Known about the structure:
Elements: E1 3-8, H1 16-31, E2 35-40, H2 43-51, E3 57-59, H3 62-69, E4 74-81, E5 89-94, E6 109-112, H4 118-129, H5 135-138, E7 141-144, H6 148-156, E8 162-166, H7 167-176, H8 178-182, E9 184-189, E10 198-200, H9 206-217, H10 223-232, E11 234-238, H11 246-254
Parallel strand pairs: 1-2, 1-3, 6-7, 6-8
Antiparallel strand pairs: 3-10, 4-10, 4-11, 5-8, 5-9
Amino acid sequence: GVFRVAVSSMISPLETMKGYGPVLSYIEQQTGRKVELVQRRTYREVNELIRENKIDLAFICTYSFVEAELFGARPVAVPQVEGNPYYQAVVITRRDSGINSLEELRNKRFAFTDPMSFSGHIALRGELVKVDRTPETFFASTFYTYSHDNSLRAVYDGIVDGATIDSLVFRSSNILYPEIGAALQVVHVSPLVGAPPVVVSPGLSEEDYQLIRRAFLNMHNEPLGKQALDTLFIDRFVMVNSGHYDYIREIAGKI
């Protein structure tokens, strides 16, 4: 049968197939199966496809992964990104806002990305537990933009007073749009968490799982693999360290 790969449509609008094409061709070469790219706007919809075994493999975010493990999604590997980054949520405001801490965002307008994002939502929902508040009882209003870049744009435009986003996206955005970056500051950083793992559906065969794991873990030793890695700005895939997501598991329990 077809091997179905699921991603969010909101990471790279108009450029998803452009970015994933080479890794999909690699999976065709390593599996001998036709590969179909399945997009959804929300991480909840992607997780439902995994849960119902409607797809084989998914590139999901870190909080999605923590929920997906509970219904038997299995980790394949995690990207080791060029610069070997560390992953955290950053809270950004405008430098000219006079809002210089998370505390000073009480009764302000705040942007989240996707409800199932750690860096775009859950990191800050987890944090607010310490003061027995939720985003709804801490902020004057909240909005789910479904995009780290749009959240960043909304802070820049004064539509919201702050946002929580992926530190990787903030870094890349400062380089590509330095005039936007210069207007913004990080007022708060989350604890470190692992990179988002690639997962397979609970229904995928153990044989297909071992093939897929070997294909990912050896991708940097294959010519088409290197082209797939270059195109995604990943140096290689490495084994999952489950401990790297324990902070997310703990937050999720405090709800």
